[PDB]
């Protein structure tokens, strides 16, 4: 049960009728309204600071809406104090301590929840982890609870009605993440069952029409430096060269200020970085231009290297304005304030997800951005000081060519997991189920097919114990099934480690100008017939006592390995281990001396990834996938140097060619043994390269049985 102050200074008001004046009268007091603590000078300063926030001036109105409506939408400018002040306003109107309930604010990020929990903890003069916390620092005295949508989803999975909460707030609903949409769909029914619950939808930017119309004409509360827009009169033939040349032009001519450039991928970004660096140096040398500092920024970078963009502009010895160029993906496209940025360069391209229902697969393709995304990119400037935004496309293109607003992720992404989660919610007929935007029936059917082969859903369409168990894990259904079936092969710990390593970005570091030593350093951990085995070796060496005697981080910086990825992998592994121990899965392993070690691991891998298998063309070049029959190749970063004709893969990636990433050799016998349902000859198309020798393997099996 929740521990709380019995209160008494709160009494004197009818429920849900708190005015702004009373709240302010409680604020300016010397004692805390919710705790017994006396206010610190820090609280005084912070109060003086936050009372002047734009969101505060509308407080009264906010209350007057929140009291008379069950579900509401809120839209305000970036950094107005939504996430920090709104839940406190809610605390002042509500009676969470009196009715023994909590209040939840949802962030799409971990770091978001943690940081805002810190800030708000300092704002309400409470120790972090006590009355205000994030999830987990949430104790029994926690009233204000910041959490990821996944956590609230878990609490919703254990408790359908979420009786613990009286008010739920979903911030940044413009991202439309899986958990967010699921939570909205659930809450729409929860509000029907229990009228004592209030729901707030917050975002800095939104197509609020959809949200209002979905929640049955819900009310919208919109609370109120110039950024100039430049369009190119003509179309730019090569957006990369145009980007480089324009950045150099702003560097050479335009006033003082830093430049923010958006691009596609990390390869392109690196190329642009070295080019702009070179020609920039030539500009400084021969044309006497100011010093130039170029910083890359993409997701696969360690948080420090990402932080490196906030460094001050270069000092000038010659008097010429020194400046900084931040080359980023769409990671800095949304909700991010860089102090030095004045100019924003936008080619108008990004990398988006494309899914083919016929193949049932997702890949990445270079696509034109959206109108909303362009307004965001342009909105990155004009904060500290007035900004200038150069868009590398015509205004006519902005009016017509550019999509209104980025296609939702659910309608794009493979669900394969979404279906499982929906089934866990208790929804039988998914086809008839009320989505706000129903997905493609093709993709749905293929997803149900995948889950049927994975034995998560029986023939009738209900959830199997395997599905009900694998739903609790934060993993992709295949990884999940693999992990579950692991301990039957007496190697659950190793499989756990492998899954953890697959759940984290690329571990190996490969410098552009020093590929040899990196490849050797990788070859040290490399294991024949298996990339997964190699990953297991890497983690097992990182967690070794020797690596700790060397300098772990030093040891990672000596073997060309990413420490951030490795520690993240350790963390994920700990979480998954806790979950396995919770749902009672045995941690089992076998000796390295036993020759069935690698074989056990491979088998356990096939248990979850039997649908993703490639076969090399008999007497030819290249591979071909068992699923949907697509011509493919092995990714250059794969350890296997010899031609193993049967392989299990983890990732499918489209770039220069159709590549297969992260593989491990397997015997077709094992595949037939593990998944007979999917590997019956009747399922596959007529005599093709796969079926021709698959049937030979079958003849073999039948001869084996015949001789016994």
């Amino acid at each position: 049960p929740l521990v709380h102050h019995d209160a008494g200074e709160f009494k004197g008001l009818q429920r849900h009728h708190t005015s702004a004046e009373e709240a302010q009268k409680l604020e300016d007091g010397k004692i805390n309204p919710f705790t017994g603590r006396e206010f610190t000078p820090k609280y005084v300063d912070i109060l003086k600071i936050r009372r002047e926030l734009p969101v505060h001036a509308q407080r009264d109105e906010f209350l007057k809406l929140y009291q008379n409506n069950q579900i509401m939408v809120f839209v305000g400018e970036t950094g107005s104090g939504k996430t920090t002040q709104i839940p406190q306003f809610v605390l002042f109107d509500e009676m969470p301590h009196l009715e023994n309930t909590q209040v939840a604010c949802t962030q799409p990020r971990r770091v978001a929840a943690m940081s805002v929990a810190q800030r708000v903890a300092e704002e309400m003069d409470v120790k972090l982890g006590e009355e205000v916390g994030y999830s987990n620092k949430t104790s029994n005295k926690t009233i204000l609870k910041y959490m990821t949508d996944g956590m609230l989803l878990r609490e919703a999975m254990e408790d359908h009605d979420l009786s613990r909460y009286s008010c739920i707030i979903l911030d940044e609903a413009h991202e439309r993440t899986l958990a967010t949409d699921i939570l909205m769909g659930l809450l729409k029914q929860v509000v029907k069952r229990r009228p004592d619950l209030k729901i707030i939808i917050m975002s800095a930017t939104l197509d609020a029409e959809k949200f209002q119309r979905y929640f049955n004409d819900a009310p919208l509360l919109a609370v109120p430096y110039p950024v100039e827009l430049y369009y190119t009169p003509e179309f730019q033939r090569d957006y990369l060269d145009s980007a480089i040349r324009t950045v150099l032009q702003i560097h050479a001519t335009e006033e003082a200020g830093d430049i923010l450039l958006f691009l596609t991928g990390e390869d392109e970004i690196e190329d642009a970085v070295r080019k702009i660096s070179l020609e920039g140096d030539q500009l400084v040398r021969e044309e006497g231009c100011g010093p130039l500092s170029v910083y890359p920024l993409y997701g696969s970078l360690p948080p420090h290297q990402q932080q490196r963009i906030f460094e001050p502009a270069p000092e000038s010895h010659n008097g010429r304005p020194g400046r900084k160029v931040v080359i980023s993906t769409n990671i800095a496209e949304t909700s991010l304030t860089i102090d030095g940025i004045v100019y924003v360069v936008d080619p108008g391209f990004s990398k988006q997800k494309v899914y083919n229902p016929r193949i049932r697969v997702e890949s990445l393709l270079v696509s034109p951005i959206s109108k909303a995304s362009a307004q965001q990119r342009a909105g990155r400037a004009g904060r500290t000081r007035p900004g200038k935004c150069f868009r590398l496309y015509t205004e006519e293109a902005f009016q017509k060519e550019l999509i209104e607003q980025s296609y939702p992720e659910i309608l794009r992404s493979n669900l394969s997991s979404t279906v499982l989660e929906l089934k866990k919610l208790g929804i039988d007929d998914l086809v008839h189920f009320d989505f706000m935007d129903p997905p493609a029936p093709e993709t749905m059917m293929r997803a149900l097919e995948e889950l049927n082969y994975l034995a998560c859903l029986d023939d009738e369409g209900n959830l199997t114990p395997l599905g009900r168990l694998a739903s609790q894990f934060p993993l992709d259904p295949m990884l999940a099934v693999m992990l579950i079936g692991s301990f039957e092969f007496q190697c659950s710990q190793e499989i756990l480690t492998i899954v953890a390593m697959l759940s984290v970005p690329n571990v190996f570091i490969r410098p552009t100008k020093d590929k040899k030593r990196a490849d050797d350093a990788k070859n040290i951990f490399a294991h024949p017939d298996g990339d997964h085995i190699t990953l297991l070796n890497v983690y097992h060496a990182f967690k070794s006592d020797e690596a700790y005697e060397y300098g772990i981080h030093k040891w990672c910086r000596d073997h060309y390995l990413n420490y951030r990825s490795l520690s993240a992998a350790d963390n994920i592994r700990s979480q998954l281990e806790r979950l396995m121990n919770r749902y009672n899965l045995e941690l089992n392993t076998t000796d390295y001396e036993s020759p069935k070690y690698f074989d056990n691991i491979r088998k356990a891998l096939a248990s979850g990834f039997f649908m993703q298998v490639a076969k090399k063309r008999s007497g030819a070049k290249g591979y071909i996938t068992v699923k949907d029959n697509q011509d493919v190749l092995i990714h250059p970063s794969t350890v296997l140097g010899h031609d193993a004709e049967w392989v299990i893969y983890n990732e499918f990636v489209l770039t220069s060619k159709n590549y297969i990433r992260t593989v491990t050799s397997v015997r077709p016998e094992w595949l037939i043994e593990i998944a007979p349902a999917y590997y019956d000859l009747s399922n596959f198309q007529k005599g093709d390269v796969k079926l021709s020798l698959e049937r030979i393997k079958e003849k073999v099996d039948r001869l084996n049985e015949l001789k016994q």
Binding site: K516, N523, P528, D558, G641, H642, D643, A644, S665
Partner: protein, 213 residues
């Protein structure tokens, strides 16, 4: 396993087919990359030697193995950056040997091998001279690079002379004029030398000798 052993013995009797036999068999993997060794390439031999150097408790074994590796890779070289890295690495082995107090003589031996090599080699001579001057024998090495350029007494060697005369200064006049027997920047530079020595009128003479050309 026996048929794979026949595939191994056939590999000893031996391209990719042995590797396919290795996959059929699938420490043996590292043994297989080693088999690839058993078959830019020399540069790869250097990079692997570098990772092995990182791996180098018998560092001396890995180093001597790097030397035999030089003996093998030398056949592949039939040179500049290959020979240059080969010299820089050999002298580096004598440098780690110097740190081990194990070195200048063997360094002279590897440098003699550099003499046995057949302008980047001049960079190697510049290197043996560089450490040789860093050694604490400045003039003694200059006598050697001079032994080489005097050995040239050809035209291509003159670029090495500019590589040599540039630091031979730290008398030098005739050493410089030898270039005139066989480059305006070089000229103004040399006149600036005499100007630094304030020979004045002699310096003007140099400008007389340039312009006739």
């Amino acid at each position: 396993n026996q048929k794979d052993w026949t595939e191994k013995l056939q590999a000893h009797m031996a391209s990719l087919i042995n590797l396919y036999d290795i996959y059929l068999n699938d420490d043996s993997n590292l043994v297989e990359t080693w088999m690839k060794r058993v078959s830019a390439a020399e540069k790869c031999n250097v990079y692997s030697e570098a990772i092995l150097k990182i791996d180098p408790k018998v560092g001396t074994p890995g180093s001597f193995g790097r030397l035999w590796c030089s003996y093998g890779d030398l056949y592949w070289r039939s040179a500049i950056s290959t020979a240059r890295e080969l010299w820089t690495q050999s002298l580096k082995v004598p440098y780690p040997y110097i740190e081990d107090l194990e070195i200048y003589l063997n360094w002279a031996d590897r440098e003699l091998d550099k003499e046995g090599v057949e302008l980047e080699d001049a960079l190697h001579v510049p290197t043996n001279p560089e450490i040789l001057l860093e050694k604490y024998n400045g003039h003694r090495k200059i006598p050697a690079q001079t032994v080489l350029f005097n050995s040239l007494r050809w035209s291509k060697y003159i670029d090495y002379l500019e590589a040599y005369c540039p630091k031979d200064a730290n008398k030098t006049k005739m050493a410089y004029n030898t270039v005139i027997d066989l480059t305006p920047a070089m000229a103004e530079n040399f006149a600036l030398f005499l100007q630094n020595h304030y020979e004045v009128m002699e310096s003007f003479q140099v400008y007389e000798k340039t312009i006739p050309l």
